[PDB]
Amino acid sequence: NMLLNYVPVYVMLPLGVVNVDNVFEDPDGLKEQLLQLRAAGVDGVMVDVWWGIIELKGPKQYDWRAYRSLLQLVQECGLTLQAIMSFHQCGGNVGDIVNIPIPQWVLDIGESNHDIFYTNRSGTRNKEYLTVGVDNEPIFHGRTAIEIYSDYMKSFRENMSDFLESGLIIDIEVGLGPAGELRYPSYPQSQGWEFPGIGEFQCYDKYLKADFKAAVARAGHPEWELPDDAGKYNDVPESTGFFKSNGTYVTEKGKFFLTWYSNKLLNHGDQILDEANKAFLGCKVKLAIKVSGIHWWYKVENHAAELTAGYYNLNDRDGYRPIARMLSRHHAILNFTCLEMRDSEQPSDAKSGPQELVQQVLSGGWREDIRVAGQNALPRYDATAYNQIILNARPQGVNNNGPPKLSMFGVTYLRLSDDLLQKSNFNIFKKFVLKMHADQDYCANPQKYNHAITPLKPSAPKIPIEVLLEATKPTLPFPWLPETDMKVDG
Numbered sequence: 001n002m003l004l005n006y007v008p009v010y011v012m013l014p015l016g017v018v019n020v021d022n023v024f025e026d027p028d029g030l031k032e033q034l035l036q037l038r039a040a041g042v043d044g045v046m047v048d049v050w051w052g053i054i055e056l057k058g059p060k061q062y063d064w065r066a067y068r069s070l071l072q073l074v075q076e077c078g079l080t081l082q083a084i085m086s087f088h089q090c091g092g093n094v095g096d097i098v099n100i101p102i103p104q105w106v107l108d109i110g111e112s113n114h115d116i117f118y119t120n121r122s123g124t125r126n127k128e129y130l131t132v133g134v135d136n137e138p139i140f141h142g143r144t145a146i147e148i149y150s151d152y153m154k155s156f157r158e159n160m161s162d163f164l165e166s167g168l169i170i171d172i173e174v175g176l177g178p179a180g181e182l183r184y185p186s187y188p189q190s191q192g193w194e195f196p197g198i199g200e201f202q203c204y205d206k207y208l209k210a211d212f213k214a215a216v217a218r219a220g221h222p223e224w225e226l227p228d229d230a231g232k233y234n235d236v237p238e239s240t241g242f243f244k245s246n247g248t249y250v251t252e253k254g255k256f257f258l259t260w261y262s263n264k265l266l267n268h269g270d271q272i273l274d275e276a277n278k279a280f281l282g283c284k285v286k287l288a289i290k291v292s293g294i295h296w297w298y299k300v301e302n303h304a305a306e307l308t309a310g311y312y313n314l315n316d317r318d319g320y321r322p323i324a325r326m327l328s329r330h331h332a333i334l335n336f337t338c339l340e341m342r343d344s345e346q347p348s349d350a351k352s353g354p355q356e357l358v359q360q361v362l363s364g365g366w367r368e369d370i371r372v373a374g375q376n377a378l379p380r381y382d383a384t385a386y387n388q389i390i391l392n393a394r395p396q397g398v399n400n401n402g403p404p405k406l407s408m409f410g411v412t413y414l415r416l417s418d419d420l421l422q423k424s425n426f427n428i429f430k431k432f433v434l435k436m437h438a439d440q441d442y443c444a445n446p447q448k449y450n451h452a453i454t455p456l457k458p459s460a461p462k463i464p465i466e467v468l469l470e471a472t473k474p475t476l477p478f479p480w481l482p483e484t485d486m487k488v489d490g
């Protein structure tokens, strides 16, 4: 049956649907929009559950009331929900039209200890997320950063228990860094970064610097220092000593640093996911993390932008499959957030390969036998964008005999706005939804298309770092069709 080819579609809700004062501002307005989505066959919606709004007053001072009202409305509108545990700030990244800082009480501690923030070589502190350096430092009124995240998710589970039991929440997206993505804030617009700048390493806070120094000492090179020839945010790779041909990134010193830098993210994610598995154990939901799509400079040997973000990906070293393998022990979903771009849409001087990057990441995930989901990186309303998303959703097209050999677990569309609802735009979006559903009508029971969700099982045993890194072995991607067999153009 064709339903086996069905890929669910979710729509992101506006940022700030619940304001900084923890108030569900316009219920009636959202309702009408939500009903529009329901009639269009949309499967569900995605929302940020902002740490800065909920635990604002103080440690463990949670107020879940506004979010309970929101979930109630979504449920009433016949939609499922993807809940993001947003432990980051809204404001300094593209599209952030509202300002939502992390909890003030955490920022107060940051006033006396500036090193709890990601820091660049110049010493600029980025306050949008707590550095991985303090994940296990008990400096937040007795708790470590990971315990804060853990306590938050547990409180969410217990306070939204009725919604979880009724099957409203489809998956929990665990925020692991800037914009909720597992990465370093290497391209901060708030510090002047501009596409296609290579970005900057963010390992200069005292905790990470100390860890690095101890690490190189144990490696027999106590004199090694953090990169000091990597240039600045808006530089191009060839103008730096670190990324130029035969540069530092290829020396023993450089390879050690890059391995150390990227391993911190793998462990950061693995440790917090452990806490997430415990908090939602037994619940009928799946866990997911977000991986950013850094396509600029992907076409040059150095992959500079990926490297500064923490993805140690080179033409001869797969820096994404290790993440996918890590996720397998948690039975988690890899949500890749750059699914709509085509290489030709990028300026030539950016050496951008979003199409190839997508193929590499998705293939790596299917290779490791984990579920892969996606999302468009920038707002798009045109058919070419939707057609590219549909292609990536089912790389080899639909199968009339049974399930397609390759398919994504779901796609989340950014974002709900008045522009999307405009007659012509919404008309195209409806066709997009239809094609994602493989020409089938909206299907309320996920079991029908083999998406039944069972109780969350405890994570499998810890996988040693050396085993995760075996996944760095380059592999050929799965074959992609030149264009989808389910085009919106009709």
Ligand SMILES: OC[C@H]1O[C@H](O[C@H]2[C@H](O)[C@@H](O)[C@@H](O)O[C@@H]2CO)[C@H](O)[C@@H](O)[C@@H]1O
Pocket: 012, 015, 047, 048, 084, 086, 089, 090, 091, 093, 094, 095, 096, 179, 180, 181, 290, 292, 293, 337, 375, 376, 377, 378
């Ligand atoms: O509301 C979810 C999320 O949206 C934005 O982050 C997006 C970003 O805009 C995309 O380009 C891509 O990177 O995926 C991100 C994660 O979904 C907000 O900036 C972020 O704060 C927010 O959590």
Ligand SMILES: OC[C@H]1O[C@H](O[C@H]2[C@H](O)[C@@H](O)[C@H](O)O[C@@H]2CO)[C@H](O)[C@@H](O)[C@@H]1O
Pocket: 094, 187, 195, 293, 295, 338, 377
């Ligand atoms: O900010 C991260 C995103 O940067 C680029 O997006 C640019 C886009 O290329 C440019 O035309 C527009 O004016 O600004 C946006 C925002 O910087 C990348 O193309 C995206 O993949 C990144 O997510």
